[PDB]
Amino acid sequence: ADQLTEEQIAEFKEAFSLFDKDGDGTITTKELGTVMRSLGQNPTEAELQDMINEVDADGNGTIDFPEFLTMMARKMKDTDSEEEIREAFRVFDKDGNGYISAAELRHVMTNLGEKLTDEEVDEMIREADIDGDGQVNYEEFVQMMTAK
């Protein structure tokens, strides 16, 4: 528990609503599995049980706030920003044709929850489209992800 400033409860609160589908005040097997599904994986039902049981200290079948912080305090794992670099490409390149297709990008919105219109879908593409080839190459992808 390295979080002693109030401000941090404030931050954590917002975070809770991120996975709380039914805002029941508890994390359940249903909402757990939905979010992972978004990760592009097809976990089996038994996965919901095995995973929840491991974190569920009180054996009540769900994860509450106290059980939440314990993990957050020890969840300081260092992810090399590179881990998501190459991997993020494979997801976008659905058919692995060596290029990022517009149809493939469209699905990305759904994951981020941007609910972009046709206009904005085309707009983003223009930004990376250094040439009127109508497709986004690996080089263009990097230029855009070159944030920090």
Binding site: F19, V35, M36, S38, L39, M51, E54, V55, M71, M72, R74, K75, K77, T79, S81, E84, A88, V108, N111, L112, E114, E123, M124, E127, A128, M144, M145, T146, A147
Partner: peptide, 28 residues
């Protein structure tokens, strides 16, 4: 658009988190 970094990048940032939560469950 200038500074198109915000639009593109924003989404990248969330994905890092996506799996930050679950890693706790798996434990490597």
């Amino acid at each position: 658009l200038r500074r198109g970094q915000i639009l593109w990048f924003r989404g990248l940032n969330r994905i890092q988190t996506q799996i930050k939560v679950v890693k706790a469950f798996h434990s490597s």
